[model samples]
Each structure stands twice: as C-alpha cells, then as structure tokens.
Target chain A: RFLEGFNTRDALCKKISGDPFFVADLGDIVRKHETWKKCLPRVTPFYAVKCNDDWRVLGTLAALGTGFDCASNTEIQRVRGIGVPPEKIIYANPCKQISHIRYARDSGVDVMTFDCVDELEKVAKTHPKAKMVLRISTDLSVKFGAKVEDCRFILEQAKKLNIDVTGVSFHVGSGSTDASTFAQAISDSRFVFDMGTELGFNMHILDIGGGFPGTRDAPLKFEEIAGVINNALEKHFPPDLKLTIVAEPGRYYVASAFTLAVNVIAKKVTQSFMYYVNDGVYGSFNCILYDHAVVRPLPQREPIPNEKLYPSSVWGPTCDGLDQIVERYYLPEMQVGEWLLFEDMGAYTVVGTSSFNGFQSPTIYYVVSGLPDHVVRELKS
Target chain B: RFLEGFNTRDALCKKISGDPFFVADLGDIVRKHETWKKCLPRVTPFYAVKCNDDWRVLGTLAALGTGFDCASNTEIQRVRGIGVPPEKIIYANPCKQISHIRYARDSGVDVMTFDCVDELEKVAKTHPKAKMVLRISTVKFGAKVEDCRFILEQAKKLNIDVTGVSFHVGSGSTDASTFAQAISDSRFVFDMGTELGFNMHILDIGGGFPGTRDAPLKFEEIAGVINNALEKHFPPDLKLTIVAEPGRYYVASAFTLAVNVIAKKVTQSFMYYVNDGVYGSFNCILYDHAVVRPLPQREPIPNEKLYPSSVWGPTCDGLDQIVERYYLPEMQVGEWLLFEDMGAYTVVGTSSFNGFQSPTIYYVVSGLPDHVVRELKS
Candidate 1:
C-alpha cells in the first residue's frame, strides 16, 4: 500500500476509483528537519501545528524531537495527547481565551506567548507561574504582535504582575519575501531582549518566528533567509551567551510534502474549457482563497508531442462562481474521468476546508521512505 | 427546555456556559413559509438546502411540505433521508458528478437540472429516464438562452426529456427589474422548447430573493414584479407550473447568533475576541459579501458614552477579524454580543479552523398553532 514513485500514485488513483485524494510524503518532512538543522544550526524548530495538524505530521515531527507551537486548547490537547511533554510546547497565540489559558495551565504547558498588558493580567489570574515570552512585531500595521514602542510598557506591566518574562519573540509575517525583514526583525528582538534583561527578567529565549518559504517557487530561499538571520544573531547576542534560540516554522516543514490529485468529474467546452473537479475551494483549494496561493494543474496523463493547449478555467464541484481554482490558464484539452495533480498542497489546505455544497476534503495517504528505524517506530506508535 | 422568550434565551445562554450559540426561532420559519405562500402565490418554493442544512430548518420546511433544491448527492440523500418524496426533490446544480447523477437515479430522484451539452450527454447515458430541466443564466452556472435551442435540440437527439426552462437572476440581486427581464427571457426559451415539441411546462425562476428586512428591495416588491411577469409570459391559463429555488429568504432572520466576549485587549480602541470567528459562523463575511453589526447582549444605560472598538475571532490569523471599527460601551470579558439574520450562508460554510468550534444552535418557538408544532416535532 505504501508504494513509491509517481507511477504507483497514478495506479492508486485508478484503483481507488478516482475521487480527489492526497499522497503525503512523510520522509520529505524528515529531510526538511535535516535542512532546518543544517541551515540554522543555533535555532531549534518548534513546528507550528496549525499549518497541517495531521496525526502523521505531528507524530513524525515529535519523533524527531521538535517543539510544538500551539494556538488553542484543542491544539495543546492534540500535542499533549501524542505523549509530547508540556515543556516541548509553546502556546504561541497572543490573544487567547481565558478558558484556553486555564486549560493550558491545567495541562502543565506553562510557557505561553503574550503581547499586551491584558494578556499578562489574564495570565496573572489563570496561570501565574507560567513563563511568558513577549511577542513584538516589525510591522505595526498587522495584527497579533505588539509594537516595539509598547515593549517597555508591556514589560513593566508584566513585572508588576510578577510574571516570569523568559524570552522575546517576533514574527516577520507569513510568506515573507525579503531577507532584510528577518535582519530588521531580529535587530528589533535584540532591543526588547535587552529591555527585559535590564528589567531583571531572565530573558534567555529568542524566538525568531516563521516567515520561511516552503516551496522553491518563493522569491526568497530558506538558506538566504538563514544567512541574514545568523549574521544578525552574531551581531546582537554572541554565541558565548548560550541562549536557547527557537522558531515557529509552519509552512517551511510541511508545504512540499503533499500532492493533491483531483478528478475531473465534469467538463464543458466553449470559447474556453471549464473543468469541474471533485475537491474545490470549500475543500483543499481553500488555500487559493485564504492563503493567497496560486496553483497550476499538472495533468496525470502524459500529453502528446505538440499537444494544442486551450485557454481553460478550472471550477469546483460547488455552485459558487467564487469557487474557481484557475481563472484562466493554458491547458491541454482534457476529458471527464482524467486526473489533475497539484503539488505543494500540504500547508494551510486541508486544515481550513468546509463541507460546503456537500463536498468533503481529500483523504491523505502517507508514504514514508528512508527514515531511521527508531524514528519510524516512534512515528508508528 | 424549549424556551419562548429572549429573557429565557439569556438564561439558557448563561446556563449553557456561554461559548457562541444560536437561538433560532422555529416559529419565524413557519411564518416565513406563510409569507412566501401569500406573496408569490403562483410560485412554489423549493427551499435551497445548501443555505442552512440544519435539521431543524429542514424539518420545519419539510413539515410545511416545501420541496428541496439539492446541489449534490449528499444533499439529495439528506433530503430523502428525512422522508421527502422523489417528486419533491430537484438536483438543481447544473454541473453534477457522474456518481451523484447515478445516486439521484438510484434514489428515485428523477427531476434533475442541466445546462451544457456534456451534462446532457452524461445524463442521457446515466439516467435516460430522468426529467431534465434546462438551466440558463449569464455567468456562474447557467447556459445562455441563446444556446438553449441547441441544448434542447441535443437533448431531443439524445432522446432525453426536456420538461422546462430555468433562469437565475444573480444571487441577492438589488434590482427587481432583473426578475421581470429574466421571466421574459424564460418565455423566449419556453417558446423555443415548445416549438421543438418538448412539454416545457415547469418554469424555474431561480433564487435571488432577499432574506432580511434590511435588504434594499422588499420581498413583496419582487413578488409583485414576478407575478406581473408571470401573468404576461407564463400565464395561469396555460397551466404552467412555477417554482423557485430560494436559499436564504426563509432562514436568515430566524437564526440569531449570540457570541461571548472570551478575551479583551485595550489599545486606542478596545479589541474583543469571541469564540466563533470568520472561519466558524461568520464565514459569510468573507465568502458571501455579508456585512454584520454586533448588538451587545447588555443594553446600554441612558446617555452612555460609546467608545471605539474592534472585534476579532479566536483564530491565530490576523485576517480573522469580524468588525473592524464599531462604537460600543466598554464591555468586559464573559459578556455576550448578538448578530441577527445569521442563518443563511452561515453554518453551511463554516470550518473549525484553528480548532475553534462552530456555534451550538438551540431552537425556540413562539406563537405557533398546536397542530403545526406537532407536525414540526413529527
């Protein structure tokens, strides 16, 4: 069942009777973990569970001894239920419900992230002994993180609450296109790190948050981003300080690990072709709408030489016009019962799916190749 | 447990431990049925199941004997599972999967809709006995009526039955004249089908009816325009059957979502976080072009000073914001806020993104006859 190769994938597609499905390569995740370690040696990766919270993804990452970045109580439970200890998880969301805060405290997951005085106050009442990390932002125009100017006030308030300020955290932003954003954000973290240190708080952890691109199509490469980051870390806090550096890389680890195959259930030919597939915007291609993703379709059947391409539009099985996948792309004429493949669909795809118009999300089929025996045993367990 | 008043609803909310929940008035749905029958007296409505697929909504509409307009095989199965007869269900989506068409056939769902030649051929091969209705529109999922003659001719060539013509004025259309024009256009296609010797008896005026009172065009005004156009084109003397596929009109106002302020942050403007956000109940905000106003469950005092505020969802995404800027009296955590007319395109499209759950719905009935209430429970 766990056959390797794209030909085997096509064989599985035909044998399973052609509804939309996924082939997730878990070994790619193992390789990505190796890449992260090699690129940013000093920084440890805390896998952002919200990107793709499949059991296999979590298990494989946990087996690799990665930390988990949780957003809510449900996520915390998911991580903790898999036997990952509480100290390996960080409640990274800044604005959290009081119930979720209490749940985190009860679960022994004490290290949480906060950006405002209100959050510190909530923690004071709910989880007073919890270690807090101040989340600052390079861009004040966005939501979530607090501005650097407000760092002193927030830190002072945390001091008044008698909360343990353990570290500084900052997110450059998702899908960050520039390496300079990392350098500038790291520089900003140093300022807040010093402010917390001067306030007599043991600020040792520096969380340079996720903006690392997962796919090769991205403008900024992961190694290039890491280069600026390491340079900034050296310029700010030297290696002699022995601080624990961590990151919440959501898409970086999981994006290219999955491939989505959608069957063309119906097709119409006019001035252009309109192919209606089983999974839609309400299902996996939700990334096209929510995550600002642009995907290209790769036909399963090999095209003949010089195959004439037509201006085509791909639509979802739902009745919504907004449920379009490709507005206008050139594609060879395809018939009903054919398959189209979309690569790099692992991140932010299935997690956001809604069963609108009665369309269900795609089922994932895991394929693991060349992982260590002990890690595989852990993942299987 | 079926409370009847808003005061009782608040007590229920408090007792249930205030996460987000809905208090749907089943009697409002019953009255909407009465209103639909009174206004569009000539047209029968097949309630669109995709708008709000709640069991209570479907059961109430089913008790009133409203037909269902299903978009997929699952919706057809859902409607039929509730004991709706085959004649009462229309597979209204123009483009359907082959499996769904076969399921519709197997389930005795004979009446289905098609717009393109591919669908016609597919239906001809799959369910030759299916009663096909031609769906024609401008964009989205309809055939151009100019292409209707060709479609009808192809259906005849394929030996498939073409019972009628259907047209949709774009969803939530503000212009009533679009209905009149579309009705007139349906007559043209009807004549073409009639000339081709197809019966063309059923005329489907597809849904664009407004759901709430705050809409720009009143439902009654659209009803009057439809009635006049039906008289001119699809006259009663001709013995034509008129039906509509209305999704939101019957369910939107009946559901009032009450969300608790689970967390709060004070900046220049107060930032309040609620349990359900755009990914949960308020998905209509992003997908359906819906604008919502929040009414605090706690009423303000006389001459209360209203401060600026922003409301956000529980998700980690910054785009999960609900209301950006609204003036409200400073509120505390654990307080509730109410959003009215959240029934349509709400729960039907919600996802549990970031693990934040969808709102729990509770039913409340008021001022209904014992017999109708009995029918609803049945």
Candidate 2:
C-alpha cells in the first residue's frame, strides 16, 4: 500500500508548485528496480517519445540511459535534440512517409519497423542497409498490423532483396490487463522464428512492444507476468536462437508519478451544487471523458459536521455548456478559491492541452525524499 | 421575406481558405437593406464584438458606422484598433472584473452597464466619470413582472451617482402577447423618470429584440409595438428623455454578406459534401441546436442527377453530416460547393482543438455584383 505521508493539501501543493520540473522521485523509483543490478541485460528499454514529449520527462529518462522509440520525424528530432545517442533511437513507425524515411536514414537512426511487403520494398529502395523489424499485427480488429501469412511474405521479400531484418515485434494493444495475452503472444512468435529460419535470416531480437501494465495494485501480478514470459521462452525457442527480450513501458513508469493541482473558481448552489474548477475538458483532463473516472480531489481541510450533502456537478469556465462533467456526485457546501489535487496525471495530459479561450496550461514539477531540499523549502516560503 | 439568392456553405469555405486574417461578410447584407428600407426604423443596432474579433469584420462594420457592444478589454481593443471611436462602443456586460473597468477607462470607452450594488461602489471608486446603466431584472415568469420594486430601489441608489437605467427585455421568451407587460415596464420607466425629476439620463431602450419576422407583413403589426412605447411615454414629464435602443437586428445586419463556395470532398456513396460552409453548431449556420435547418445548396451546372447528400462539419476531415439530411436531386462532387449567409454566433465558432484549423475568416470583396470585380480584396 502507498503511504500518505503529508499532513495537509497545502503542504503537498506548495511542495509540487515550487519545483515544477524536478524528477528526483522518478529517479528514486528507478533506483528501486530490483532487476537493475542483478541481470546482464542485453535488452535495452526504448522510451516511446510520442507518449509524453515533455522536455524534462524525456531528459530525465535519457539520463537513465534508455533507448527511444520515435514515431514521427518531429519526435525523432526531439529525442536527438535532448542529446540521446542517434544509434539508440529507433524510428518505430512502420508506415513511414518518404520524407521521414530520408530524415531517419540521414539522422543515423538505422532501425525501423515494417508490416507490409510494399513498405519493406520502399525502405529497401530508400535506405537498403538500414536494420528493420517485422511488426506482426495480433489484433485482427485494428487497422494497424500485418497478418501472420503476410509476415511470411514480408520476410521472404526482405530475404530476396538482401535487406537486413534484425527483429520481430508485436503490440498487444496499449495498457494490456490480461497476463495470459503476453504468454500467448510469445507462443505466437514461434511462427516468425520458424519463418526466419526457412528464409535463412537470423532474427536476434524480440520486441514485446509497449503494453506494460501500470501501477494498479490488483489481481493482475507483474511477477506472474515475468514467470509467464520465462515459461513461453523455454517452450517456444531453440537453445541456439540467441534472443534478447525488450519492452517499451510508457504508462508504467510515469502514470503514477505526477499529480495536477487545480483551483476551484466558483460554486453554484441550485438543485445540485456545481463546483467550477480551473481545469476542464479543454485543459489536459479530456481522459476523464474517455476513461470514465474523476481525478480524485484531496480536500484542503476537514469538513464541517452537519453540512448537507448535495448532489454535485463540476463545470469549467468556458461558455459551452457541454464543457462539464455530467456525473452528479456528493460533496459538502464549498466556496470559490479552494484547491484540489488530481493524481495519475503523468501521461497524455499536458501533451493534449489546447489553448482554448487563452487559458494557461498547468506547470510540471518533480519531488524526492532527499537531495531536493530546496524544493520543500521553496514550497513553505 | 429574405430572398435566398446564393449558397452560403460553399462560399464560406472559399472565403476562409483564401484569406490571411480571418474575415466575414457584413457589408453585402447592408447593401441588401435597399429592399427592406421602408419597413423598420425605430430599432437601433449594436454589433456584439465578442461574436468574432476578426479585424476585417470590425473594419467593415466601422465603415458602415454602426455602434459596437463590447464584452471585454480585448474586444474593446479590437474595436479601437479598427479606428472606431471610443464613444460608439458600449460596454454591455454588467458583471465586469476590476481590470476590465480600468481598461475601459484608459481606452476612453465611457458607457457601461451595472447590476449589483457592490458593482456600483466598485465603479464609483475606479471610474467616477464613467457613464453607467443600472440594469433592472424583470421577473420573466410566464407573463409576470413582480421583481421591479427591488430593481427600482437599486436604480434610485445608482441615479444618485451613475448615468442611466437599463433592462434586458428578456431574450428567447416569445410571447408577443406580453406587449401589455412590456408597455407596463415602459410605464415603470416613466414613473422612475417622474420620481428622479431631473431629465433622467439615457433610458436604455431594452431588447425582446426580434429577428426578421416571416410574414404577410403589415405596418400596424410593428406600429403596435411603437404605440405601446408611446403609450408608456405619453405622460408629460417623461416625453423628452433621451432614449437608447439595443436590438439584434442592428448587429445581425452586418452578418449576412457574400460567402463563397470553395470545394467539396465526396464519400464512397456519392455524397458530395462541402467544407467551407456553415455546417457545425457554432461555425457556419446559427442553428442554435434546435433550429436544425439547411440553407439551399447552389451548384453551377443545372439539372444534373447525382446523389442525395449533405454538407460536412468543418472542424476536421470527418463525415460532413448535413444539418437536416439534404436530398440533392443531382450534384457535382469536386471544387463546386455552396455558401450560406449565417448570422451572429455562426462566424465565431473557430476553436483551437483538432489542430488549430479553422475556415479562413475573410471579408467579402465589396461592391462586386459580379464575382470578379471588387474593392481591396482581403
């Protein structure tokens, strides 16, 4: 269980507001990884640059020596600008524009993904010597990936062209909850290995692409996940097939790291109480609409004894009536100028903010137990 | 009756994609006043600047020499930027931040409105010379007017210092049968005039402002509204008071100018839809949610059998669902599109979401009866 150490919301707010870009807590979280020191790890974790493009977040992750997964030319340039080694970056978007392919080849990112035979042919014509991965689509419903039979056709085509095929990759959708899906996915990878063998191509890498479970302390266990991967590896591959397993964990690392501090602007008392907040659907909180959850508000003070519990709705200050949460919740009578804290706000929030009505976006900060003493002092001040 | 001369949706898209700074057509509609000139006169218009702040729209309205109803400092700055004199701008918002008051004072915009007593004190402290209007609230309860006593008392307090009296002649409540109640309101204004004694400052002509009525229009129908006002003002002392009238017709007149139909993107089902038109809630047509009506679609070629279809929403390259499913007897699917002459709230629907993309807001090249010849093109 996570411990709530702070006594007041104001203390937490002050601490967070003072050091907007500090990431010492993230560094501490990384330090607690038990596998960091124990393994002779050949598999390098590549941070998906598109997931959260905040300069500080990227810089912090870069300092930890992770490779990057870039989707667009802009994302690749962003990763390189932060001083990440060009060789450590993978241009992961399979359906590449000609300009993007030219840019990736010129910028020294030799590795990319290909799911179609035509895409492989285009890459072969453009950058013949670049290393590429076959992105086999597991989800039949989505428009994204190549079929199992098409994967064989692509590998055969790559072999004929004498193109370098380095690895096999699969995305089990974003934020996978089923542990058995990972094991089933690796079991399915046996087809690619057998196909690569038939085509006389050596495939050395297995990219279990970016669907890591987040910090939900529930029935889905990470240890069981590791065990399932080990079982699948032993069951499927030959001892001679030298392989390194890699995973891109975006939400896993940062989802629980940051919290948004919102200010209450107005409270209307009608049939139901309406608490208007500074942030809304326009300002980085759109996930609440799709995800169907409110950012849990940590109240600043203890509530009074006998205040009538009113069915409440929340609204933003925009003129559009739809810019509101329709869920009628229950809260005590509140006033304007109060504050609340919204957690699990590390990813997708700041990246999607729009400058509607000229409203200012939220500022980010970092925190840790020690070494960032000035952050805490500044909060108090 | 307003004549449906041209397609509005297609014309709007062409104007937006072609112009640099966002502009809208307001002058062409003013030219149309040649037809409707003899019917309406008593209504005075104030263009609401918050509708669309595009400088071209403001410049055209200023050239027309219309008064402006501003909502914020940014809006006031926009009007002043277009060289509209400060005295012509009325700060119509009752609830204003202190910064807005200072901005209005500094920018030489003197006329403003007030409602609460605390707001009166606030204005008294910051803008002592500011011409104020005490906004009264009439209890709009299915033809009842009960709350005038408190508002009258507030008006008396404000008259000790402030400049004028104002009331919202309740919007969207269409009981024209309530002209008796409205005449009674005018009598209350006359009573306030009699009590205040010194020729009371501007009696803000309020608004149950009408849109252009669809009618076998007769003069006596409009004359009844004038006669009601005259009946309330017939008392000898209230006869000579300066009147201030604000109606939607004045501002909406600048909204119905020429729009150009640029291009149309078609679907697999032969649904040839245009982008440059007013299809969305806030963008093209001011349907206001309930009024889901489609203006006529004008294609260049005559009597061609294409497909039954509609225009698309402009926010993104999505299915441009027509307002009320349009059955085009025949239509061409390419660059040929239609335009609509939408009123207020339709032009200002440009949002920053879905990638800061909006219709190129442009003013119509004025004095061009034929599409090619015109004044300095935006």
Candidate 3:
C-alpha cells in the first residue's frame, strides 16, 4: 500500500522537468502494478522493455519483482544493467539476429523465442542450450505472428535439434481491441501446450503476450481482457497441470504513468487555426503512426470566462505535413507561449520517429507519490 | 576525373560500418560536386547541415570551400566544429528561439533569417546588430511569407541590419514553374530592399533542389531554369552575390545503405524483415520522402520468379516498414537488403528509439582526382 502523494505539476516543474518535458508519476505505475495483481492475479507480468525503456520505469518494475520482455541485444543489456537476473528477463521477440542471439547467450540470458524454422536453425547453431518459446501471432493486422502450420513445423524442427521448448506465447494485438481474439489465443496456446507435452517436451509455462490496453480511458478495457484471460487460465491449464502463467504487459504499466506537456511555439490562421507546438508526431507523439491514436490537445490552465471555443489544428515544429499532432479540435482561442499536454503518452510515444527538423524528444520529469512504508519497500525496497 | 571503385561490401562489414550500415562513396560526392559546379556555376551552394549531418559528408563539403546553411545552434556549432568560418554559414530557419539568436550573434555567425513581425521585434530586442535575411515562403505549404510593404516597413522601423532576401520554393517541388516563380519573386524582394536604402547585395535562393532523381524533374533542367530566370530578373549589373542552400543535391547519390535481412515470412505477399527500416537508416523514406529500392544482391540472382513483397524494419512497431509493396526477386532470410542513394536526410534524423544503434558510416575513397581533391583542400 504505497502512500499516494506528489506536488502539483507546476510546482514540480519549478523543481525539475520544465516546459517541454514528461512528468512520470510513480504513483500511477504503483497503482497499475497493484491493479494488475488484483485483476490478473494468476498472470505473472514481464514488463516489455521496448514500450518505454525509461530506466526509472524499468528500475521501479524490477524492484517490484517484475520480469522483463526484451527484443534486441542492447535491450537485454539495459535490463541486465538494471540488476534484473538473467532468468527474470525473456527475449520475447520471435525473429532475432544471430549476433543478438550470441549476445544473449554470452550475457547468460538464455530464455528466448522463435517462430520459423530458419530462426530455430540459427538458434540451434548459435545457442543450442537456450530455453525457447513458440511465438504465435494472434492479431490479423501485424506481420510478426506465425501461422498454425508454421508453429507445428517449428516445434518439429526444435525437437529434431533437441532444443529446449518450455512455453508457448502469442501477442494478440497491441493496444488490443478484441477480447474474443485473446480467448481464441488462450485456446490456441493450450492446444500447443498439450502437443508440446505429448512430443516428449515438458512445457510448464504459458506466455500471454502483451496487448493489454494501457492508456487512461482506453476504449479496449483491460479489466474485461483481464477477466477473460483469468477465466481462460482456469479452464485451459486448471490447478492439476500446475502451469506457470505470465504476461508481457508493457504498455499497461507505463502508458498512464507519463504525461507530455509542450510549449505552443507559433501559430497561423488559415481556413482553420493552425497551432504549432514544440513537440509533434516526430517527437513523443509517434503513437499517431505506430498506434492508431487520435491525439486530443488539453490546455494546461482552465478556460476563462467568455473564452470562446474555436476549431483549431495542432501541428508539430517540423515542416513535414505528416508531423501534425492533432487534426481537429474545438478549443478556446489560444495564444502563443501557452502550455498544452497529452495524457497516456508513456507507452510507444517516446520511442521511434526522428528529430527530422532538429526537433527533439521532450525532457523527462519524475513525480513520486507517497506510499506506505511496506508498499514503498515492495515497490522498490 | 574520379575512377570507379571495386566491389567489396564484406570489407565494409569487417573494416567500418557494421551490418545495417552506410557506405559513403567520397569519389561519388567529388563527382557530384563537379557536376554542381558545371550545371549551376553562378549559384554558390550552401549545404544544409540538418539534411544529413554525417561528419564525413560535412567535413568533405567544408573542405570543398562550400558554404553551409544551419537551422539551429547545434547545427551552427557542427559547421564551426569542421573549421568552417562564420562567414561561410547561413542560419536559415525563420522562427527561432531567443537563446539561439543570442548564440548566433555571440559566435560571429551574424547572418540569420526571420519572417514574422514578432520575430523582427525579438531580433530588435536581442542581437540588434545581426545581419538578417527575409525568408519568403514560395510554396503553398507550411512555409511563411511576408508582404513586400510589411518587410520594407519592418526594415525601416527596426535598427537591424537587413542584408538580403531569401526565398524557399518549398521541398519536393517537381515543377519548373515553381523555380522560375521563386527566382523572379526573390528579385522583386531584393528590388524592394534596395529601394528602402538597404544594401541588398546578397540573394539567398533557399533550398528546394531535388536530389539525384531522374523522373518528374531532372537536376540539370531545374538548374537551367534557375539560371535563365536569374539572368532575366537580376541582370549582370545588379552586382548581387547569390547563394543557394542545397541539401540532398550534395549527398543523395553518395550514400548506399546495406541492411541485413533478419527474418522472412511467406504470407499473402512475401514479408521480409531487415535489420534497418523506418527506425534506422530507412527513416529517409518516412521523413524526407525517399523511395525504397533494394539493390541487386551481392550474390547476384537473375530474375527467376519475382513476387510482390514488403520490407519491414526490425522493431516491435509495425509501422516501421521500408517498402510497403515492391516487386522483387524472392529474397531468402539472412540475405542482405541494399538501399542506394541514401545520403540525404538519413543520418541526421536517426535517433535512439528502442535501443536501435545508429548505423556506423564507412567511407570509401578511390584514388582521388588530383585537381579536385586539391581544390577541396584549400
């Protein structure tokens, strides 16, 4: 029970992270961590490193005894650098580089994954003694997930090479919309798990890949997904099998944890009011491209009396047309040098995209809320 | 004359730029530099630093006695870092922070640009002695343009040194008409400056020059159009020293990106995953509007059964794709994917996202042409 507290954003800004920066509330992460435990009790969470690899986030999660899901060589190093044990991190990306595989083996982080025969062969040559997971694609949109036939052949190839196959994992979707897709994935994982057991391999773990909606007021509710997964866990594995159930919930932990506030640089009035902000889609709002996000702008201060609302579009500092942050908005007539913010930017926001026109990512600010001594200790003793 | 080099992508891997790397052909840049001199001799090109601030590229361009166009303070610092003098650089972005303007005045890089009255006021209040260029937006894009009367009026009121008029014919313009119009417009702005008793001796024809593309518009044709317009509008006696900011024009063809194909999937259309995609070197495709063409493999394969395929980047973000849909020979997993003409706008923007290491650059210098390298040396 972490004591919940922190100063107002402005006061904290005066203390640290200035105008164009992120304010990450550790309280939000702690509350979400506790919420995941309460909602999906059976599922052990491995925080996905790629989501928001802010060391403070990783460090806090590691202290909470959470596992990490890493994609690349350096990602593993970052996790290991944060003092997480090799066993506590999962190299969850199905397709990997040979150098990275060798890197993982050299680093003693052996548990990795594969989806195709070519990948397994590379693994067999590179690190034969590594524990492997079968990565099943659950979403219709993405290209990474493997087909049922592909997984079957992959298991066969691993068996032929005498590779250690310990678990089956599936990423249904990122910021997943459909729960039925998840239920279907659970059923598919069970089918593979039973087959792995029959094939003389002892499969004891099931990795429910990350798709949990992590943003505040996200349309795809995580509580509903959590319930479906919990129900499926009871039915598929049950108590008799004694399976270790875990999840790769990266966004769920960090999305609401960070808030991005930016400065209104310049603006022009054409048919519509074009408001230019310091940071744009190229900066921290890259979720517009990777995640189908409709970014809404929020004015930092309250709208004054008779501050009539007018339609405006928010643009980034970059000259590229696609660098537009929010397309349409009905906001009070704003002035230059004002502050605006976007919520739930902790996930895929900071990563990817470029500083195309010399525009950079926002500076980071941390806000730690008060917590009970015991909860604070557990959060990071 | 620069001779062509030998084929050795593996030596590149062993010696310098690792897999997911960039090979900068210095001889090609040398040739391209010669070509720019031949086609547009009257126009002094100031290379835009933000386009692809790869140090070797900048260093070579600096040694060639070329001017640099900088947008921010750090970019100015970078130009100066290569020992390019303050007089050889133009700070071209119209809207700027006050700190950056102060930095410019202090560093002796006195030339800068501004478009709005607010900007003029800020300049007047801070760095009043800074030589200013009126940046006119020639394209129907996010560019800013000021009215002639307003610019002349601003010059009269402010105690700032208004040196020249700069006009940008916005990027990605394939039409010749835009160049003719922008050149004519720059002359008109210069006329106003001279009438206002300001010594408008400099004309900064800002960047919109397309890099080495053959279709839609050719570089030579654009250069020809620009020179004809410059001849007609300014005449020889105007004594206006002219400069153009060229980005991709200098280095687009100079880069050849070699990425390792990491994974392959047999979907409806073949999906190939490469070590670098939108997040890495291929960000040129996303930001600078570059096309993705896979160079013929090192182990050459005559076209057998070609299939439609997509090349995605090595990242969890699904949008980090290079080729959306391209018809290419069926490439196997673990083979290398090559993208040529990547020198423009690639490295400057490649950032730290998901721990993807920035591609290391390998420089290949064929025995250089004597006069040209010597010309660049001074």
**The candidate that achieves the highest DockQ relative to the unseen native structure:** 1
Give iRMSD, candidate 1.
1.6
Residue-wise C-alpha lDDT for candidate 1, range B1-378, written one tens digit per residue:
355454435545555545688888877888899999999988889999999998878888998889999998889989998889988998998888898899999999988888888998899889998989988884558888788888888889999889988877756676798999888888889899989999788999988798897788999999999899988988785568999999899998988888989778887578898889888888899889899998887857998778789998888888888998999888888888888899999998888777777888877776675754574455
> B231-316 in candidate 3: lDDT tens per residue?
99866655678899988888887877888888787764787888887777877776667787886455555656678888888787
lDDT of each: 0.86, 0.54, 0.76
Candidate 2: stretches off by over 4 Å: A1-12, A15-43, A121-128, A156-163, A175-177, A200-202, A213-242, A290-293, A302-308, A366-381, B1-378
Model 1 per-residue lDDT at A8: 32
Candidate 1 overall lDDT versus native:
0.86
Interface C-alpha root-mean-square deviation, candidates in order = 1.6, 8.3, 2.8
The predicted structure with the larger TM-score, 1 or 2, is: 1
For candidate 2, lDDT tens digit of each residue in B1-378? 112223333345444341112233444545533322333343334666654455655665566556787766767877888778898888876645466678899999988876545455557666877876656555111112344344446545655344555555533544443444554564565466447652445555554444344323322454465446645554334434433333334334344333222223233233332333332323323223323333343433576554545444322112234443465544432233333334444545433322123444444444446432222332
Predicted complexes: DockQ each: 0.71, 0.08, 0.45
Number of the candidate with higher lDDT, 1 or 3 = 1
Better of 2 and 3 by TM-score: 3
Q: Flag regions of model 3 displaced more than 4 Å.
A: A1-5, A8-10, A13-19, A139-142, A267-273, A319-321, A333-336, A370-381, B1-18, B139-146, B266-270, B301-309, B324-334, B370-378
Docking class of 1: medium
Q: How would you encode candidate 1's per-residue C-alpha lDDT over A316-347 as one tens digit per residue?
A: 88878888999889899999989998999999
